Amino acid sequence: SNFFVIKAKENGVNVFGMTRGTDTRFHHSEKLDKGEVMIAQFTEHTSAVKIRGKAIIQTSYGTLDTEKDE
Amino acid sequence: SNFFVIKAKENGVNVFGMTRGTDTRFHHSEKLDKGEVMIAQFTEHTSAVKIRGKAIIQTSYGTLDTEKDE
Amino acid sequence: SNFFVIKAKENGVNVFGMTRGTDTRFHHSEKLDKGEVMIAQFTEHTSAVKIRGKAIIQTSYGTLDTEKDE
Amino acid sequence: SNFFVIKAKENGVNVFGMTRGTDTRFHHSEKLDKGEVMIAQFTEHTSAVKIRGKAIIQTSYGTLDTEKDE
Amino acid sequence: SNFFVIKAKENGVNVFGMTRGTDTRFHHSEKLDKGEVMIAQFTEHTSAVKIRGKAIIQTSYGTLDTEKDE
Amino acid sequence: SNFFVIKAKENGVNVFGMTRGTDTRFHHSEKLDKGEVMIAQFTEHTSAVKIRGKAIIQTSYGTLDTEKDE
Amino acid sequence: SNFFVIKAKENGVNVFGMTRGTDTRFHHSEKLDKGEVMIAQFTEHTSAVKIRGKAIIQTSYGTLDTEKDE
Amino acid sequence: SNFFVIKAKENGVNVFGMTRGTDTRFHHSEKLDKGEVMIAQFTEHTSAVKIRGKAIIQTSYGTLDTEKDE
Amino acid sequence: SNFFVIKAKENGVNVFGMTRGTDTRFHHSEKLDKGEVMIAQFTEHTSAVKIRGKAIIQTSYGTLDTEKDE
Amino acid sequence: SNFFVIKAKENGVNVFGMTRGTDTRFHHSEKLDKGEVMIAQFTEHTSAVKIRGKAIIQTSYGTLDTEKDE
Amino acid sequence: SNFFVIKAKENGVNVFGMTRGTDTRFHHSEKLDKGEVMIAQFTEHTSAVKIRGKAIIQTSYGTLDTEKDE
Amino acid sequence: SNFFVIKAKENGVNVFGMTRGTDTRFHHSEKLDKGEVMIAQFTEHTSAVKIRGKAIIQTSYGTLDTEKDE
Ligand SMILES: N[C@@H](Cc1c[nH]c2ccccc12)C(=O)O
Ligand SMILES: N[C@@H](Cc1c[nH]c2ccccc12)C(=O)O
Ligand SMILES: N[C@@H](Cc1c[nH]c2ccccc12)C(=O)O
Ligand SMILES: N[C@@H](Cc1c[nH]c2ccccc12)C(=O)O
Ligand SMILES: N[C@@H](Cc1c[nH]c2ccccc12)C(=O)O
Ligand SMILES: N[C@@H](Cc1c[nH]c2ccccc12)C(=O)O
Ligand SMILES: N[C@@H](Cc1c[nH]c2ccccc12)C(=O)O
Ligand SMILES: N[C@@H](Cc1c[nH]c2ccccc12)C(=O)O
Ligand SMILES: N[C@@H](Cc1c[nH]c2ccccc12)C(=O)O
Ligand SMILES: N[C@@H](Cc1c[nH]c2ccccc12)C(=O)O
Ligand SMILES: N[C@@H](Cc1c[nH]c2ccccc12)C(=O)O
Ligand SMILES: N[C@@H](Cc1c[nH]c2ccccc12)C(=O)O
Ligand SMILES: N[C@@H](Cc1c[nH]c2ccccc12)C(=O)O
Ligand SMILES: N[C@@H](Cc1c[nH]c2ccccc12)C(=O)O
Ligand SMILES: N[C@@H](Cc1c[nH]c2ccccc12)C(=O)O
Ligand SMILES: N[C@@H](Cc1c[nH]c2ccccc12)C(=O)O
Ligand SMILES: N[C@@H](Cc1c[nH]c2ccccc12)C(=O)O
Ligand SMILES: N[C@@H](Cc1c[nH]c2ccccc12)C(=O)O
Ligand SMILES: N[C@@H](Cc1c[nH]c2ccccc12)C(=O)O
Ligand SMILES: N[C@@H](Cc1c[nH]c2ccccc12)C(=O)O
Ligand SMILES: N[C@@H](Cc1c[nH]c2ccccc12)C(=O)O
Ligand SMILES: N[C@@H](Cc1c[nH]c2ccccc12)C(=O)O
Ligand SMILES: N[C@@H](Cc1c[nH]c2ccccc12)C(=O)O
Ligand SMILES: N[C@@H](Cc1c[nH]c2ccccc12)C(=O)O
């Protein structure tokens, strides 16, 4: 039931899915062009993700901007 | 059980369903003309979606506008 | 247990039910004339819907108006 | 447990029950005269309803008036 | 488990219980004189009700007055 | 687990229990004199009640007064 | 888990337990003198109670005074 | 799992446990001197309690003072 | 899963555990000197406690002070 | 799932774990020096704790200071 | 179902996964360059994580900044 | 499922995991340099932790600063 939203602020965003289990590798990379949105769950096969590029990210904890200086 | 809403702001918005499981591919593409709405769940077969085009997207985290510059 | 409400703002509204499973196709189209309302669930057979025409749409995320310039 | 309330604002309201399952047909039509109220659940046999005529409709998401211009 | 309240504002308010299942019929009629109250559940046998007459009706969505013109 | 409270405002109040199942009839009538209170559950045997007389009635939806001009 | 509290405002309060099941009879009467408090549950054997005399009564729905004029 | 708190305002406050089941009797009496506190649950053996004496009583409904005149 | 907290305001505080079941007796007494704190659960073996001495007592219903003139 | 936090305000704090079951004895003492923190659960083996020394204690019910005069 | 978010404030951030069970060791290290984000769950294999570098960290308890002088 | 956060305010903060079960011992020590963060659960093997050093600690009860004098 846990899910997250990624919106690409610019071209060049990638979302990597990381394998659930003893081993940790990237099993999929989804590219996002500017304006594209991926809505994705954690699943049997995906227990972590890594996001690269200029993006807005939403989870239960709020909205995160990758370009912002905190 | 988790579900999301997509309303097209222009013709040709495209909603791709991504397969649940070890493999990740687009198993379905649903196009939306301006003003059309898709309401869709995550399911046994669909564990992520990719959306392209000028659209309003709603999840339990709130409403996103794909056009908005952050 | 998730349900949605559609009210036709004008004649010509259609609600398509999309099949649950590996196969995705329309299994039903319900036509709504001005003012008519459909209240419908996601179900064993329906895991997504597509709505066409000038309509008010309600989900747990709130009320959408297809005609609104967003 | 999901239920809805319909109050007829005038004579000529009908509430159609739509069959749950692979097939979608109207299995019952209940007529409401002005002032009459139907309170009804979704059930094993009913997974969607269609409402016609001048009516006030209540669900979890609020109260809807079929005659109103949104 | 879902339940509703009906208070008669006049004599001869009538509460019809509608059968759960494939068939839909009135299996019981309970009449209420002015000020009398019925508190009733949905059950194995009752999946909808139809109410006629001047009455106050309460559900988890709030209080409805059958006389009020909207 | 749903329960209701009835307080008699005057002598002459009666609380009828209505049988659960295909058959609907009164299986019990409890008389309340002024000020007396009944607190009762819905149960295996009771799926609806009817209240007659001048009474204060409490459910999870709030407090009703049978004598009130609504 | 459903429970209620009775405090006697004066001598002469009685709390009657009513039998759960097909039959409805008083299986116990507990007398309360002024100031005494009974805290009691609904149970396998008790599905309703009747309270007589001058008392303060508390349930989930609030506090009720038997002597008050509503 | 439901529990209650009793603090004595005077010596000789008395807490009687009432048996769960078909029979209702006091199976235990616990006396409290001024300022002493009992925190007790309802249990397999105890489905009601009777309290006599000047005391503060707390339940999930709030705090009661047995001395207070209403 | 219910727990309680006792802080000794002065030397001489005692917390008695009362046995769960048909038999009710003290199975343990824990002595607390000034400032010492006990945090304890209800359990398979303990269904009530009695607290003696000058103490601050905390439950989900709030904080009590045994020395307070109520 | 029930847990508590202890922070030592000064050297000389001890946290005693009390055995769950028919018998009640201290099965472990953990010493805390000034500034050290113990976060601990209730468990199969621990159903109560006793805390000695100058400490800040946190539970669901709030923060308690052992040195404070209430 | 608990998850956490890590955003790298600068290059050089590392997220170590710590093994669940009797054995505790690092089974994975994910490196994050400036702006990159990891969203990850606790899992069958990971019961703790250690984060090194200049990072924004989000959990259900809120947002932490590793560089902040606390 | 319960989890906690520890951020080091100085080098050499030390987090000791304490064994679940009849025996209580430190089964693991994780040291943190200034700014490093551990996010950790209670588990089958870990039912308490002991933390030494200048640190910010977060639980569902709030944030604690080990340096703060109360
Ligand atoms: N294979 C790892 C992936 C992972 C999840 N959460 C992590 C946190 C840190 C490092 C790796 C992970 C797992 O399922 O446990
Ligand atoms: N429901 C899990 C993810 C998940 C789905 N199927 C699974 C099977 C095994 C392990 C985890 C999962 C979550 O929200 O976090
Ligand atoms: N209920 C899941 C989706 C889902 C439905 N059927 C499934 C079967 C297997 C795995 C996941 C699912 C969710 O809301 O996220
Ligand atoms: N087949 C993948 C699809 C997926 C879900 N969430 C993801 C996040 C990142 C990359 C891929 C995914 C899965 O079910 O796990
Ligand atoms: N047959 C698809 C229908 C579907 C649900 N959600 C979707 C999102 C995108 C595309 C298709 C879908 C399924 O049950 O999984
Ligand atoms: N409750 C499901 C829909 C549903 C009903 N019956 C089903 C049987 C199989 C799969 C899904 C369903 C949902 O909202 O997601
Ligand atoms: N027979 C369909 C009825 C239905 C429910 N929800 C729908 C949404 C759109 C179209 C039809 C429906 C079903 O049970 O799935
Ligand atoms: N409880 C379901 C409706 C329902 C009742 N019985 C059913 C049997 C099968 C499928 C659905 C149902 C709901 O609220 O939505
Ligand atoms: N509990 C259901 C009604 C109900 C009771 N018994 C049933 C048996 C079958 C189907 C429904 C029911 C509700 O609140 O809506
Ligand atoms: N026999 C129908 C009664 C019913 C319930 N909800 C309805 C809505 C519309 C029409 C009929 C109904 C059923 O149990 O499904
Ligand atoms: N015997 C009916 C009693 C009943 C409950 N709710 C009702 C509503 C209307 C009419 C009768 C009823 C039943 O158990 O279903
Ligand atoms: N808990 C049910 C009433 C009830 C108790 N026991 C029952 C046995 C069968 C049917 C209903 C019941 C309700 O409030 O709706
Ligand atoms: N023997 C009845 C007692 C009862 C409970 N609620 C009632 C309401 C009205 C009349 C009687 C009752 C029963 O268990 O069902
Ligand atoms: N737990 C029920 C009462 C109850 C206890 N044991 C029971 C056994 C049978 C029926 C009801 C009960 C309530 O709070 O309402
Ligand atoms: N858990 C019940 C009391 C209880 C405990 N054990 C029981 C065994 C039988 C009946 C009731 C009980 C309550 O909080 O009210
Ligand atoms: N033996 C009775 C005790 C009781 C509980 N609640 C009551 C209310 C009134 C009278 C007696 C009781 C029972 O378990 O049911
Ligand atoms: N042995 C009694 C102890 C008890 C619990 N709650 C009580 C209230 C009053 C008197 C005694 C008790 C029991 O388990 O039931
Ligand atoms: N969780 C129970 C106490 C308890 C723990 N283990 C038990 C075993 C039997 C009876 C009660 C218990 C309560 O708070 O009421
Ligand atoms: N061995 C006791 C310890 C205990 C828990 N709560 C208590 C309260 C008072 C006295 C002792 C205790 C038990 O598990 O029950
Ligand atoms: N989960 C219990 C403690 C506990 C863990 N394992 C247990 C085994 C038996 C009894 C109690 C426990 C609590 O939070 O209170
Ligand atoms: N292997 C340890 C890892 C761990 C989790 N939480 C901890 C807290 C402190 C030290 C180690 C840990 C465990 O699963 O229990
Ligand atoms: N849901 C667990 C993590 C988890 C997933 N699968 C597991 C299998 C075994 C143990 C733990 C897990 C938690 O957050 O604590
Ligand atoms: N879920 C427990 C910890 C836990 C995980 N696996 C366990 C196995 C046995 C006992 C406890 C556990 C908690 O949050 O506190
Ligand atoms: N081995 C102990 C560890 C522990 C948990 N909570 C405690 C509180 C005090 C002392 C020790 C502990 C246990 O699992 O129970």
Numbering used by the authors:
A (entry chain A), B (entry chain C), C (entry chain B), D (entry chain A), E (entry chain C), F (entry chain B), ...: 7 to 76
What does the paper say about this structure?
Unlike most other Bacillus species, the RNA leader region in the alkaliphilic bacterium B. halodurans contains 19 NAG triplets, which could potentially interact with TRAP. The oligomeric state of B. halodurans TRAP was unknown and we speculated that it might contain more than eleven subunits. In this report we show that B. halodurans TRAP forms 12-subunit assemblies, unlike the B. subtilis and B. stearothermophilus TRAP that form 11-subunit oligomers. The main chain r.m.s. difference between residues 8–70 of B. stearothermophilus TRAP 11-mer (wild type) and B. halodurans TRAP 12-mer is 0.48 Å, indicating that the 11-mer to 12-mer transition is not accompanied by significant conformational changes in the protein. Comparison of the B. halodurans TRAP structure with the available structures of TRAP 11-mers indicated that the C-terminal segment consisting of residues 71–75 plays a critical role in selecting between 11-mer and 12-mer TRAP.
Here we examined the factors that define the oligomeric state in a circular protein oligomer by studying the Bacillus trp RNA-binding attenuation protein (TRAP). Studies on B. subtilis have shown that when TRAP is activated by bound tryptophan, it can recognize and bind specific segments of RNA. When the concentration of tryptophan is limiting, TRAP is inactive, which allows transcription to proceed into the structural genes.
